[PDB]
Structure formats: C-alpha cells, structure tokens
Amino acid sequence: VVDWFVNFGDVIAGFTGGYSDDSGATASWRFDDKKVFHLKNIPSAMVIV
Amino acid sequence: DINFYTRQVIDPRLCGGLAFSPKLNLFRYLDAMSLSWNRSRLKISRAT
C-alpha cells in the first residue's frame, strides 16, 4: 500500500514538465442540389439537374 | 364469312402520349423552393 501511494504521488507530481499536443482541420462539402431549367420560349421543354 | 378477334398495343413510341404528362405543372412547380429546405437542414445540422 505504501509503495502504491508513493508511486501515485511521484507520478501525480511529475506532470508539469511538459504540456503540448497536436491538432487537425477538415474541409467538407455536401451537395443536395436538384435544379430545374426551362428552354426559354418553350416552357414544355425542360431539364432537371 | 370472317370471324376472329385481335388486340393491339398503342405503340407508345409513336402514340401513347397526347396526354397531360403529369410531370409538368409539378416539375415547374415548387421543386425549387421545396429543395430550398437546405436552409432548415443547415439549421438543424449546425445544432446537431
């Protein structure tokens, strides 16, 4: 028990020396575009994208 | 004396149209503004 306590104490005391880590960034696109176009002067003709 | 029966298709390549084609009056309809629910989707995704 005393060995466990002293090990815990020395570990929890020895942390301040270093403090740093990494990072990351993402770039994402989502497309859900359902577009409609009319053949102008011919409304019957039409195109869906 | 002739007596027989036949049944024929309406050759939809040539005929079979000549109707309203319910695609239209609905495709030119709200399909754009209804799609514009991307606003609401972005709103919910922001808090998601």
Q: Quick one: three-class SS letters along B1-48?
A: CCCCCCCCCCCCCCCCCCCCCCCCCCCCCCHHHHHCCHHHHHHHHHHC
The angstrom resolution of this structure is: 3.1
Partner B contacted by A49 (CB < 8 A)? no
CB contact (8 A) between residue B24 and residue A48: no
Distance CA A45, CA B11 (A): 23
CB contact (8 A) between residue B35 and residue A48: no
| CB distance A37 to A45 below 8 Å | no
The structure was resolved experimentally with cryo-EM
Q: How far does A30 lie from chain B, in Å, by closest CA? A: 11
Contacts 24+ apart (CB under 8 A), B33-42: B35/A32, B35/A33, B35/A34, B38/A32, B41/A32
Q: How many CB pairs under 8 A join A and B?
A: 19
